Amino acid sequence: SYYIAPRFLDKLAVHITKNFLNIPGVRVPLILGIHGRKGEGKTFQCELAFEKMGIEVTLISGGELESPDAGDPARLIRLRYRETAELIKVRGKMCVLMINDLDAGAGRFDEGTQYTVNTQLVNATLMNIADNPTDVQLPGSYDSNPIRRVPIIVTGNDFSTLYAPLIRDGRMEKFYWEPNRDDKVGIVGGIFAEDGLSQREIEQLVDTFPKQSIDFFSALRSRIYDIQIRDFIHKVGFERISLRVVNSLEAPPEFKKPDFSLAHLIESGNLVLG
Amino acid sequence: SYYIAPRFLDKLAVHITKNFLNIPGVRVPLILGIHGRKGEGKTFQCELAFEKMGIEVTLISGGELESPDAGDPARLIRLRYRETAELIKVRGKMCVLMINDLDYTVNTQLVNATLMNIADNPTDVQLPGSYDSNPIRRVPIIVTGNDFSTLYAPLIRDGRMEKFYWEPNRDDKVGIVGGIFAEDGLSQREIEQLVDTFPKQSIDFFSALRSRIYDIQIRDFIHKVGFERISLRVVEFKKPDFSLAHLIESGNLVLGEQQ
Amino acid sequence: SYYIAPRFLDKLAVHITKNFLNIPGVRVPLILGIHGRKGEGKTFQCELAFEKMGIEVTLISGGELESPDAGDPARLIRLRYRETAELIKVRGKMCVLMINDLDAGAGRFDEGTQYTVNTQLVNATLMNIADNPTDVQLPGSYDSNPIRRVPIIVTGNDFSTLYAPLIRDGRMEKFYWEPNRDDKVGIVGGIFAEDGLSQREIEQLVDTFPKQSIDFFSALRSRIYDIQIRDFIHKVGFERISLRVVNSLEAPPEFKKPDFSLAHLIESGNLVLG
Amino acid sequence: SYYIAPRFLDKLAVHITKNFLNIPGVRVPLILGIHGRKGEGKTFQCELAFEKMGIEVTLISGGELESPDAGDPARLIRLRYRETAELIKVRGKMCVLMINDLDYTVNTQLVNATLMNIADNPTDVQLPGSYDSNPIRRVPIIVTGNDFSTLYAPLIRDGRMEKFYWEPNRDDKVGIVGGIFAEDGLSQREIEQLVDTFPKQSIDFFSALRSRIYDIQIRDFIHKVGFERISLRVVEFKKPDFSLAHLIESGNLVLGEQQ
Amino acid sequence: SYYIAPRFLDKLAVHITKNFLNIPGVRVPLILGIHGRKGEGKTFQCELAFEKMGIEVTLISGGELESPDAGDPARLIRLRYRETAELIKVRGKMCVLMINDLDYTVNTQLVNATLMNIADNPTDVQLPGSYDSNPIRRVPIIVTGNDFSTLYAPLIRDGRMEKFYWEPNRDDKVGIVGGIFAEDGLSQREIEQLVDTFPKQSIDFFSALRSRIYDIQIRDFIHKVGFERISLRVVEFKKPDFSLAHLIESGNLVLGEQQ
Amino acid sequence: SYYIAPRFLDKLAVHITKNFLNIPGVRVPLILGIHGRKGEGKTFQCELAFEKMGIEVTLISGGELESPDAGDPARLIRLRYRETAELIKVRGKMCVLMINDLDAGAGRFDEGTQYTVNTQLVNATLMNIADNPTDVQLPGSYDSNPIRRVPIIVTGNDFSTLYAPLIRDGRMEKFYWEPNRDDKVGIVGGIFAEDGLSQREIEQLVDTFPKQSIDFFSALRSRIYDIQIRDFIHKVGFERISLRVVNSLEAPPEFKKPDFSLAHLIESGNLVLG
Ligand SMILES: Nc1ncnc2c1ncn2[C@@H]1O[C@H](COP(=O)(O)OP(=O)(O)O)[C@@H](O)[C@H]1O
Ligand SMILES: Nc1ncnc2c1ncn2[C@@H]1O[C@H](COP(=O)(O)OP(=O)(O)O)[C@@H](O)[C@H]1O
Ligand SMILES: Nc1ncnc2c1ncn2[C@@H]1O[C@H](COP(=O)(O)OP(=O)(O)O)[C@@H](O)[C@H]1O
Ligand SMILES: [Cl-]
Ligand SMILES: [Cl-]
Ligand SMILES: [Cl-]
Ligand SMILES: [Cl-]
Ligand SMILES: [Cl-]
Ligand SMILES: [Cl-]
Ligand SMILES: [Cl-]
Ligand SMILES: [Cl-]
Ligand SMILES: [Cl-]
């Protein structure tokens, strides 16, 4: 039911596969930096691609690299790297290290706290790894055998100028994700795939809200269930609704998919934006 | 008995319940932003609904997030969120986080930023500097304010926050005002007349009008006894007029000298 | 000679008296918050009312709550509360606790120092007291008998949103003080009461400077004595003026009240504003 | 002997004395703000009057409050205020606090804020963080500056501060300039001519003009001896021309190359 | 073999050498500000010239000065300057300090301020808080950025900094692009055609175009094998088309979906 | 070849000489404060004057007074003062103490570091010295004989209001240096003195760039040598240019003075400003 943008799947599949091939004549970047604004399915499209290709993923949260409880982020990144490399030797399949939301509380998400991702240390680490993907030792350790090369995917809203040297030496490649009209028709099409909307109506929906994100359209669909939810609360009664939903004694409530029109969707859309 | 406006009760109940229902292929907004004129019962009716539904609420005051004496509003929000998340696991009931009178400019950005981050991942809400692999329960957030900053537009567009404008209509006033004077022996028509006499006023005006009727009796009692000997006299026992005529008389005197 | 605004006296007298009556059917707020801008006689009108009604007042300065030398402000507020309550039992008269300038160095009065009133602790304390005015123990003390309810008056330029819960539960009532035209005619009338100005001229004076504070008008009157003061300095001579005034050997200089017109007052007023 | 302008002496003396007189039913401004063009003798004449009246003055420089090296200007003002307040009790004489050249933007607000707070309660002036039940003596404050910020308008409206614009007229110049050249053997008409020759200049120009007459002699002495051997010669003894013609000659050369 | 544009090599070599020549009666700018569109080879050609001239370079990244994680950019610049100054004394060769991608706003002022101060006295460059009577060697500084703030105008006016706008012309592209595809068996006319096909693009586009030719082969190999079984297959061996037709085909597909 | 502005030389020579004469009837300022913007030859004109008059100079850098490594700046200033005074008694010639760039990293030169010149301590010191130039003891020392008066020259972009008391008591004199048209013709004339430009062309050059500093014009002249420098690099070859210039084995390269016109200078000027 979920639509994968072909060019998104291609970019990510080519990047990973290219890191498991040894093609001379060109340098392969170890790191793929996927940036773009929120609510466009950056991470979600990655997951669809990893599922599609059967790729196991070692994950590092940006809130993990932000926290002193992660100890030294340089140490954590290296550990997870060596962890992912072993899985390649063991599982005998493509494995990927992924660092999500590399700029956790930066910009319009800044909460003005003491703690922030040591981006310069993270950058420095990725630079050290990228220079020699086969020899990635923990700080202090020296006597260890060559290790498997692990492709790295990093996502964020944008990437610092600190990453320019990585890019300039082809150790990293930036991929800007902003869904175009063709992408939106595809993605929004998959969201309303079971709602009996034609190709044109889906195009009209996209064309009616050309500046909105993918999340705007899925949110548009979700609010239609509210009438059923209201009625369901009335039947159960306000006094007992809490027990009915949170206590998993009786079966969860079964809701029907509602019939709606492009007209209705557009009306709702304008109300949301209004 | 105090009156809850049906469409207010619905909107709030649907939002909370919708956050505890895990319908697949359906993404839910975590935040309900209730906005409108001050003193229209945004807070009071929220509390009526929580009582009605037996919902335990974790309440943060807006002034608690604005005052520099609070220090770190991001921390305070995240603490109260994780606390409420735990009460869901423990009590096995619907629980809610609520932020009141949200409408300083430095902190408004930080609060907005915090609610955005939480709404992006309601399950992964860590304290600043801390990290915990344990997923916590999703906690619906109810916010109250006069109007919400354009900083909240991204949340509303992406369906991470739902706005709900609260402006009580005539029926809503008749119900609410009727509950305010429920024990003052006023008929339906006398309640309808009172509302129709002050059609542009907030619910706050009417609850204030009731209190002033008592103040009037106390004022006249002081004038009779005199300011000179009022202290000795005390150191105003009968039920006040409360007629529809007396209330209208007081209301017009308040409108002549309001704020 | 000083004019008390009736509605100011009523509000304050009703608030206090209401706290010594036990009228059912309505909750009595313990706290009256009087706010409004400077130079309008907030505190001065309170004092006139307390004198009028023979009410003894326990005072807490905002600069007191700002100072660590006051120790714990929660502790100080409670002490003064219990102190005022005993006076009710002893004196057998109405007694009031009053906290002045609750926002000392906030806003346009901010001197950018480390020290400021812990408004959140003060608020928290008043909330604890207001919830149970009869049981107000010092932090740590527990075994103490019920105490007399003490009405509290707080003054400030404005009150934080922190006080909304107190207001919402009717534990506190806000009273905004901005003198209206009728109030000004009264107050300004009392200022120029012995200056042989008619009712109309006093109205004209108020109408000529409609945006000014009460302090503007009293200041207007005070500057007229300057000629007498000048001449008095000349007679005594600049060499000996310091001894004459500061050393209380001989009698203080006796000044006559000058004759002046509405015209003169308005001219002076425009010069001051100019 | 240096000349104090009578209306300047009056205005300043009346302000100070008025602050030590406790006339009932009469409220006094604590602050006198003397404003006007730079170098017109605002500071110099203040000092002449204090000497005349035997007033001990506590002086704070404007640069002392503007430089971030000062740290806390609010503290510094309050320290000097309480200090002056104590000298009144001890010496039993009129004492004054004076702030010079008040005309950075961060500190200007803090200074304004401090003077406002003090002027509101001249008797209750505590240091930040300190509290003392003891009332202290009221200390008149004299401020000097080119012009006062609109931040001071509330003070002036409420009669907590009096403004006094200082622009010396012809009579004032004749007196002041006459005192500058008092020991140079110039007649009244020669002083009047000098002022009338430079009618738009500040008092600062004239005291600077006198100093330049000496510099001219020294300049010519160096030209005669030569820059090559001037060091040996020294390591310019007679009274300079000082005629009304020579002063005018110098003045025009200064106006041709001023600032 | 990679191509350096002659006028780029000249301008940069003249600037460095001019800073090591002590011609009397001739003052030299310390800083060369190379500005122009992003990805036109400002950095890459600087490195080619340093290699050509055997110049050891001390390199600071622009992001190293912009990120608040750096802490003190003034310190970092001064440290690297004194370090380079010492390498001149030790190695007895031309050395250079270079700051890349200089085009946050708080730090831009601090960087500008630092470069101004250094350019005023290249011999007297102390660390903040430190002082050393020892004069150090003059170190030419090369800066790179899209455009330089008007904060740098004083430097350029006083001849403490020279601006050099870099926009590669056709000849420059033919040379540079020719070096990018030097080992791909393309003739001169095929290189000239490639440049003339994309006359408005940056050098970055062309080096990116070469890399995409390999990505295309890998993409088609994945489509053939299928996404389902690509992992097993691997856990794309031949020389790609690289014809002038294939490059143009790829380029147009990149222009249809760029940034 | 270098032009000294007469009025600059006069002001500085009169100030110094006046400090070695004991002329009654007027107070002599000990301190001359020379301020004005950068690139106008403030310090350079001072040096030309000191050379002209054979005056030895004790120097204090503003970066010296900024550094804790200078210890106590009050102590340093006093030491250098007493050091300069002894040279007067020994050398038997005019000697001067000079404090350069008294506002090192202030304003548009602020690098946002912890360290800045303690201007208030420096001011306080100069005030103490100026009050009694003959008795300048180090902090702690007391038993020392009278010392020679030393004139002080301070340069900066501007001087704080902290220096007003020094000025007001005639202990200090401000001298604003902004070269006028006559000064520029002189200074720029000396810069292009050997370039066969007429008086009018030099006036035209100045009039073409009326808002520019002296440094703008000298920079204008310097860039003309670039062609010779380019060619010289080509002859030696890029591979060996570093050895040729930095290694002082062979003689330094000999460059000829180029011929150029007013037209060429103006073209270059507009390009620089453009
Ligand atoms: N539902 C109600 N029943 C009785 N009184 C009400 C009701 N709603 C509002 N009030 C009167 O006005 C108050 C002020 O309204 P509030 O809930 O604070 O509105 P807001 O939160 O919109 O400012 C309530 O505390 C009350 O005194
Ligand atoms: N009354 C005076 N008698 C002699 N000289 C004066 C007099 N007033 C001003 N001056 C000459 O000009 C100075 C600069 O004036 P000042 O008092 O500083 O004015 P402002 O404080 O207005 O800048 C005085 O110090 C002095 O050198
Ligand atoms: N001279 C060159 N030879 C080969 N490739 C070049 C050359 N110059 C630029 N490039 C291609 O584009 C890059 C991006 O250009 P860069 O030097 O970073 O420009 P800027 O510094 O102007 O952004 C170089 O690293 C390279 O991949
Ligand atoms: Cl590392
Ligand atoms: Cl849109
Ligand atoms: Cl109404
Ligand atoms: Cl408490
Ligand atoms: Cl007005
Ligand atoms: Cl004039
Ligand atoms: Cl093109
Ligand atoms: Cl000292
Ligand atoms: Cl110009």
Curated annotation (Swiss-Prot), chains A, C, F:
Belongs to the RuBisCO activase family. The keyword ATP-binding applies. Activation of RuBisCO (ribulose-1,5-bisohosphate carboxylase/oxygenase; EC 4.1.1.39) involves the ATP-dependent carboxylation of the epsilon-amino group of lysine leading to a carbamate structure. The lineage of its organism: Bacteria, Bacillati, Cyanobacteriota, Cyanophyceae, Nostocales. Keywords: ATP-binding, Nucleotide-binding. ATP binds at residues 36-43. GO terms for molecular function: ATP binding; ATP hydrolysis activity. This is Ribulose bisphosphate carboxylase/oxygenase activase. It comes from Nostoc sp. (strain PCC 7120 / SAG 25.82 / UTEX 2576).
